From a paper:
In addition to transcripts encoding an FP clearly homologous to A. victoria green fluorescent protein (avGFP), as we expected, the A. cf. australis transcriptome also contains several transcripts encoding other, much more divergent avGFP homologs. We have identified several new Aequorea FPs with the potential to further diversify the landscape of fluorescent probes and biosensors.
We were surprised to discover a second green-emitting FP in A. cf. australis, AausFP1, that shares only 53% amino acid identity with avGFP. AausFP1 is to our knowledge the brightest FP discovered to date, with a nearly perfect quantum yield (0.97) and a peak extinction coefficient of 170,000 M−1cm−1, making it nearly 5-fold brighter than EGFP on a per-molecule basis. Despite low expression in its native context, wild-type AausFP1 expresses and folds very efficiently in E. coli at 37°C without any modifications. Though brightly fluorescent, AausFP1 is largely insoluble in this context, and when purified, the soluble fraction of the protein runs as a high-molecular-weight aggregate on size exclusion chromatography. It is possible that, as with other FPs such as dTomato, the dimer interface serves to stabilize the chromophore environment and may contribute to the unusually high brightness of AausFP1. AausFP1, the brightest fluorescent protein currently known, will serve as the parent of an entirely new lineage of super-bright FP variants.
Author numbering:
A (entry chain B), B (entry chain A): 7 to 64, 68 to 232
Write the structure that this text describes.
Amino acid sequence: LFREKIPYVVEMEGDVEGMKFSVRGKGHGDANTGKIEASFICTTGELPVPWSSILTTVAQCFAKYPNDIKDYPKSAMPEGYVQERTITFENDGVYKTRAEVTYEKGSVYNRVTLNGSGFKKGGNILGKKLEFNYNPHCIYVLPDVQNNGIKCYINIVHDVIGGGQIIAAHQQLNTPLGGGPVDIPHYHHIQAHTILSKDPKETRDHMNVVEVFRAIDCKTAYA
Amino acid sequence: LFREKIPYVVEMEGDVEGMKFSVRGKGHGDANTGKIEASFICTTGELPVPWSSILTTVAQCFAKYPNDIKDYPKSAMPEGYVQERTITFENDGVYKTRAEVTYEKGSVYNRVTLNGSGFKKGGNILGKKLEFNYNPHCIYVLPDVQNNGIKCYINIVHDVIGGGQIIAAHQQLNTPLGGGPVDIPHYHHIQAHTILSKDPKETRDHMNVVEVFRAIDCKTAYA
């Protein structure tokens, strides 16, 4: 199912303090390498929040997994899985997100909704004061047998224009869309690395993305 | 002054919901390997909270640093540095801690105070329902030039007796005790690995620790 590089499609609807927007993305994921390359367009005009703020919201199934850690997202495929997050920004509001990640017609689809509230008028998010770049991160993956899934935790470091960084605290739940058996792993990490870029020839508000996700058995590797 | 294995001494005073306690530790740290081995005794009787809950509170200077990342804690030595943390436990209270980490008489000293409040009667902390073990973790180290130091973020995964895990969210600030020059690094990670043990011959409430800390230039290493 993930033996080859395969197409990745994203359909996102957002609403942040009443500002509605749509994002569409197309790219590929290669679970052999853990690499994602995708292009995102805001199809409703100007994105009303920083691109970096929605990077995590816009495919964990593409992560490079070794044989000796259960791969919950790939196990939930092809019927797929629900990915829910609360993202709380330092001194600012929260994104609540609900995604359905499915395998259809040789492609992975990430169809995701986002609501934002509690954001400050001239803060880093509504003021769009975050740099257009990204930092590498460590994703925590924990078993959640009670929910037939995994709970994940991430701190995201956002670089602020003119110096400084803020944290976006991520709480994440992945549960199955199917009725099939799922593989629920022991606690481990996913190393994340992300380069954001623009196409100079692209006139629409956009974000291009090159990502690497590698699962690490930290109980062994950090010893 | 970190070229050799050197002694490590810890003096901790705690107050959680009015329960006062003292912890003393002795061991060594080796910054060549990133290894800490130390023994902790509660000198006031029974520890009123889980040992694992105070593991992070009871020497980042011992972490194994490569040449290409600035080592803030070693740079602050020998006058040393202040380590402040807010630790907020899932569905439970918060530890506020202030440490002074110094080099005196051939030894690293961690003299640290802890206050706990907002804890639930019969919860995982006051009920001591956390397992006597520890998980590996990823420490985020960020520059904080405004404070002549570093800000660090950690999620700690605590295993609960009889199954389950909770998160202890760590916010950490390190500032100098001296007026000397300090080395403030770019954003990077410290991989942490910790094994807890008891001495069968020890009659006092106690915790022995073997730890490995390695700084990783994640901007490069995760690519």
